[PDB]
Write a protein that binds this ligand. Structure first.
Ligand SMILES: *[C@@H]1O[C@H](CO)[C@@H](O)[C@H](O)[C@H]1NC(C)=O
Lengths: 249, 215, 214, 214
């Protein structure tokens, strides 16, 4: 929902952590031109859990969407944004011609034409150093054997669909070493007391009758056990109340 | 805003070089591609010229467009015009704000059409309509070359006092004209007279039918 | 070949919301042309651009008709509709839907057009269709007459479209009473006047009322 | 899929030891095909089989080249090298590495091959080439000239490896002084000559020199 996205050579990245990863709210936007996922499945993405999510946001020119993919090669892929060979995530792209275009030409977006070497995975390089095509120096201005590093996009509303500005958001889901923290929503049916039902409070799988009791736990304690290492009571994570766990009959 | 101006009507002899021009007023023509479309009466427009120099398949080689940035205008020159190309033409462009604008239109006319006589035809009201307490005469004109053909009605003694309708002639499939006329009256007045006639005005001639309601 | 089919109520009361539906046949709107526009043309006047819609939600409208034109699309039914609120007598025009090719460098190439339809913006004294037969050398002419109908768009047919030789049509006209009239005849030999009775199958499109008469 | 990639210098002095290294991607050489061979082809001539090596060290060489060809394998890097000592001027050929599907019934099925690299055997040792671009109906054309270089393999990319539609290359020819010349052009629209500069990208592999000019 951002009002302005950065250029492809200066793509801005945001870190997502310590929250409920509800990916279903993404579908409320415009129909996505590309929703290719690698490794992960968009159908059950909310079921899995990850550690950190890198949201790479940038705008490219139409057909350049096919260049953002693990193992691709091109102008943008080698000098503006390079994905790793084992990327695990989804690439979301949609058209934004009605926003990132102006009749006089929206030259606010630029891209790096070339560099001396290819970019590393997730590497960012912003600079105004004039490229030295020849052995002669290129100080001051770009002479005959010199060229500017950045080039500007046109992004006029009259261009074809292959040249329209497309906002692309790349999400990363690699778990490096840390335990996962963003799993998403896990809603379920409400409580049912005075009847033997199966319970799974925070992973405590079992079967028993839930009933209220005066055994108020400590503010940091979650469940209780007896001398036989058997779970006797547990708190409701929705509304904090101690409920005993006893076999029905 | 990018408005385009076209001449409303144009005509030229067949097998000659004809050029249809369309000028811009509030924009640069070189910013977008100008397209030309041929639309015959009673049919949808068909793409003739696209990308300002490309012509699709099926279109004859006589059609050819041109772009003039100095006069900010476009011209569609034709080589060897004929009767099969007699239709309307429009120049379509795009404004700088992705707004498409169509031209004012250009009525092409072929003067080298063969001369022909009008096929006047008159139909009297049938008994099924007379039983419905009404009557309507249908006069039909077709196959006539001049487009200024008017209609007239006579009761063999004086013009008919009943209501008279007049239709504007239009082109047929074979580049000829066709028209029609109508007259409505009561069945009692229709059956109480000797004859009614539909007079058609033609260049140097006139044709009438004089259908008699007496059975 | 790709064919389009306009649809919608042929008669709309003034100050109401106009609605027309265009059906796309021959594929789906994902990668074909990426654009589908509407074009109207007043009777005897030039064309007029309305606006196109993209399957990703991008919409463009005419500056003169921004607040009145509303365009929507449905990828599941492969149909896009045009809406016009607060219509008046000035909106009398034949509406067409067409595809716009954007695969090139710029938007262009209105390659295919629909069949088109006219919308009556009048509802005063609305009446249904009415027909009356017309009485008729080696050949003779005769046909069927349609009158007393208020809506302008009407369709004609002969022998259910089987062997329609000699069929000719004539332009309609609005009578002084406020109703239109249409005439369609067919050229047949004089021997077929009393044998092999031909049937005219005109149809009132705004009401789908089929009438068959000799 | 599993593919091969040749590597090594393309210009070797006479009477020296030819060294080339083939790189396998994905499939390590322990159980895949059990055999990987080298094949060289002189310019405009037939294929000359050199020899294959097994993963357990079972080497095989060509009878005509037994006294000079030495093949080794390195399973730790999934790379196998080819050595050719006492090279001659007639040894000018393009070397390729390919695998053999011996895992079947008998030795057959040369299914996958590499891209190959041209190896020239001469004592010229000329440096990188000098490049000169060629600045520019409805369509136009422009190119970039490459001359003054003895080793042939060079890159002819355009627009940093983008918009390859209309790119054409021409064979090289040796000048009287002993240098090659190269030319390659691309078809571009005449109206787009003002923007979207079509940069030509060249790289001299024997010296790793890259020049980019408009
Ligand atoms: C968020 O998206 C809606 C459309 O889905 C848009 O109307 C709104 O302006 C966006 N928010 C911002 C801050 O631009």
């Amino acid at each position: 929902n951002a009002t302005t996205f950065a250029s492809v050579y200066a793509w801005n990245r945001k870190r997502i952590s310590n929250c409920v990863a509800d990916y279903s709210v993404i579908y409320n936007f415009a129909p996505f031109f590309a929703f290719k996922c690698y490794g992960v499945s968009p159908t059950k993405l909310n079921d899995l859990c990850f550690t950190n999510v890198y949201a790479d946001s940038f705008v490219i020119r139409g057909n350049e969407v096919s260049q953002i993919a693990p193992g691709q090669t091109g102008n943008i892929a080698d000098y503006n944004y390079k994905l790793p060979d084992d990327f695990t995530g989804c690439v979301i792209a949609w058209n934004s011609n009605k926003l990132d275009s102006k009749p006089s030409g929206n030259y606010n977006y630029l891209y790096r034409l070339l560099r001396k070497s290819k970019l590393k995975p997730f590497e960012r390089d912003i600079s105004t150093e004039i490229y030295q095509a020849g052995n002669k120096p290129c100080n001051g201005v770009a002479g005959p054997n010199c060229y500017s590093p950045l080039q500007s996009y046109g992004f006029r509303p009259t261009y074809g669909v292959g040249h329209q500005p497309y906002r692309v958001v790349v999400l990363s889901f690699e778990l490096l070493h840390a335990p996962a923290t963003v799993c998403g929503p896990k809603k379920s049916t409400n409580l049912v007391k005075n009847k033997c039902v199966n319970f799974n409070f925070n992973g405590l799988t079992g079967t028993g009758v839930l009933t209220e009791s005066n055994k108020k736990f400590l503010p940091f304690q979650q469940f209780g056990r007896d001398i036989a290492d058997t779970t006797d009571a547990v708190r409701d994570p929705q509304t904090l109340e101690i409920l005993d766990i006893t076999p029905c009959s | 805003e990018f408005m385009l101006t076209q001449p409303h009507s144009v005509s030229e002899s067949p097998e000659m070089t004809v050029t249809i021009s369309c000028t811009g007023s509030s924009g640069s023509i070189a910013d977008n591609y100008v397209q030309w479309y041929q639309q015959r009466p009673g049919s949808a427009p068909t793409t003739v010229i696209y990308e300002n120099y490309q012509r699709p398949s099926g279109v004859p080689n006589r059609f050819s467009g041109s772009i003039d940035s100095s006069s900010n205008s476009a011209s569609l020159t034709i080589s060897g015009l004929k009767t099969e190309d007699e239709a309307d033409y429009y120049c379509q462009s795009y404004d700088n704000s992705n707004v498409a604008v169509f031209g004012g239109g250009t009525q092409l006319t072929v003067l080298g059409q063969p001369k022909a006589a009008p096929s006047v035809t008159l139909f009297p009201p049938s008994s099924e309509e007379l039983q419905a307490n009404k009557a309507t005469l249908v006069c039909l004109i077709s196959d006539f070359y001049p487009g200024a053909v008017t209609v007239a009605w006579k009761a063999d003694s004086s013009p008919v006092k009943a209501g008279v309708e007049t239709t504007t002639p239009s082109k047929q499939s074979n580049n000829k004209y066709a028209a029609s006329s109508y007259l409505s009256l009561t069945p009692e007045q229709w059956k109480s007279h000797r004859s009614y006639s539909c007079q058609v005005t033609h260049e140097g001639s006139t044709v009438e039918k004089t259908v008699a309601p007496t059975e | 070949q790709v064919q389009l089919q306009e649809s919608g109520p042929g008669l709309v009361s003034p100050s109401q919301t106009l609605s027309l539906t265009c059906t796309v046949s021959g594929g789906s709107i994902r990668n074909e042309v990426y654009y589908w526009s509407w074009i109207r043309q007043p009777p005897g006047k030039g064309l007029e651009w309305i606006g196109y819609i993209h399957y990703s939600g991008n919409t463009y409208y005419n500056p003169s008709l921004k607040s009145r034109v509303a365009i929507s699309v449905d990828t599941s039914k492969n149909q896009f509709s045009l809406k016009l609120n607060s219509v008046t007598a000035a909106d009398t025009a034949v509406y067409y839907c067409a595809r716009v090719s954007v695969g090139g460098r710029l938007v262009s190439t209105f390659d295919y057009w629909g069949q088109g339809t006219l919308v009556t913006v009048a509802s005063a004294s609305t009446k249904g269709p009415s027909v009356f037969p017309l009485a008729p050398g080696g050949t003779a002419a005769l046909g069927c007459l349609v009158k007393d109908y208020f809506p302008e768009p009407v369709t004609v047919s002969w022998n259910s479209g089987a062997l329609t030789s000699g069929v000719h049509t004539f332009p309609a006209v609005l009578q002084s009473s406020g109703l239109y009239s249409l005439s369609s005849v067919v050229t047949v030999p004089s021997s077929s006047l009393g044998t092999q009775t031909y049937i005219c199958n005109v149809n009132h499109k705004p009401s789908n009322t089929k009438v068959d008469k000799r």
